[PDB]
Amino acid sequence: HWGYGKHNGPEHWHKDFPIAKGERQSPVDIDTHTAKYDPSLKPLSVSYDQATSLRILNNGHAFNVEFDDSQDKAVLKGGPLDGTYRLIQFHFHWGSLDGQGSEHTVDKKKYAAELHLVHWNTKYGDFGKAVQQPDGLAVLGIFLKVGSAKPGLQKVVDVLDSIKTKGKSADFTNFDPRGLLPESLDYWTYPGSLTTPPLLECVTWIVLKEPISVSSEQVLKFRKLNFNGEGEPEELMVDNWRPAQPLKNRQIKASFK
């Protein structure tokens, strides 16, 4: 099965998922000089005040913080989006070292990690139908750099020892994802894909320019997670990021000058 190893990593995915070599794959490098400011882009509207987290899961590739998406609660709208998108889960991608881990890059700069807040377009009724549509998902991407701790991340960090290995989950209620948001909502946007199999070309990417800082200790705890299941040889969950993919016939737009 696919993963983040030397024999099943990103360069192999196209054999089972040949959309891997498609026209709108993610992530990409954001060349900041050639992204154009688009004055028609709107401010991003992030409304997380009623978000209801339920559970955190080690799925063997990352951990997902899952949300109850059965009511109109935690929604993303505005920005480049038409309509409204409901938060279903967030997760991260990170490195074995501070100098790598992000999926998107900025003028080739790799950040230590990247947070993905995943939302589905309500007009398609559920996530599984949304991923079949070219405007089905909106993923809010936020870079992480190592410096001062992020207080709003610590609750996630401290539950990780309970979900060390693949297939483990833990209750995770009352987590407020507003505590993971940078001060500024300036962003870049482009049409792309899921960054893990099935690599479906269903995402409007919204990547914030301002990173959040987390401490070394916080990322170090991400790096103690395991890709393996309990009772199997330990494989640390590190370097769970896909490299930048060809931009092809796409424009990256900036919300800001």
Ligand X SMILES: Cc1cc(C)n(C(=O)CCNc2ccc(S(N)(=O)=O)cc2)n1
* 204 carries a ligand binding annotation: no
Residue 32 annotated in ligand binding: no
Binding track, positions 87-116, relative to Zn ion; x by CB under 5 A: -----------------------------x
User: x-or-dash pattern for Zn ion, window 114-143, by CB under 5 A?
Assistant: --x---------------------------
Interacting residue ranges for ligand X, rule: CB under 6 A: 116, 118, 127-128, 131, 139, 194-196, 198
Beta bridge partners of 214: 146
CB 208 within 8 A of CB 141: yes
* Nearer of residues 40 and 70 to ligand X, judged by Cβ: 70
Close Cβ partners of 11 (under 8 Å, ≥ 6 residues apart): none
Q: Three-class SS string for the chain?
A: CCCCCCCCCHHHHHHCCHHHHCCCCCCCEECCCCCEECCCCCCEEEECCCCCEEEEEECCCCEEEEECCCCCCCEEEECCCCCCEEEEEEEEEECCCCCCCCCCEECCECCCEEEEEEEEEHHHCCHHHHCCCCCCEEEEEEEEEECCCCHHHHHHHHHHHHHCCCCCEEECCCCCHHHHCCCCCCEEEEEECCCCCCCCCCEEEEEECCCEEECHHHHHHHCCCECCCCCCCCCECCCCCCCCCCCCCCCCEECCC
CB of 114 to Zn ion, least distance (A): 7
Active site residue 61: yes
Least CB distance to ligand X at residue 134 (A): 14
Binding marks (x or -) toward Zn ion, 189..208, rule CB under 5 A? --------------------
**Partner that binds at residue 194, options Zn ion, ligand X, none, CB closer than 5 to 8 Å by kind:** ligand X
* Min dist. Cβ of residue 131 to ligand X (A): 5
Question: What is the rounded CA–CA span in Å between residue 38 and residue 26?
Answer: 21
- 189 a known binding residue? no
22 makes contact, choosing from ligand X, Zn ion, none, with CB < 5 to 8 Å by partner type, with none
Set 12, 14, 33, 61: catalytic member: 61
Q: Is 7 annotated as a binding residue?
A: no
# chain residues binding Zn ion, by CB under 5 A: 1
For residue 132, the minimal CB distance to ligand X (Å) is 8
In the complex, least distance from residue 36 CB atom to Zn ion, rounded to whole angstroms: 25
Residues that bind Zn ion (CB under 5 A): 116
> Among all residues, which ones are annotated catalytic?
61
| Numbered residues of the known binding site for substrate | 195-196
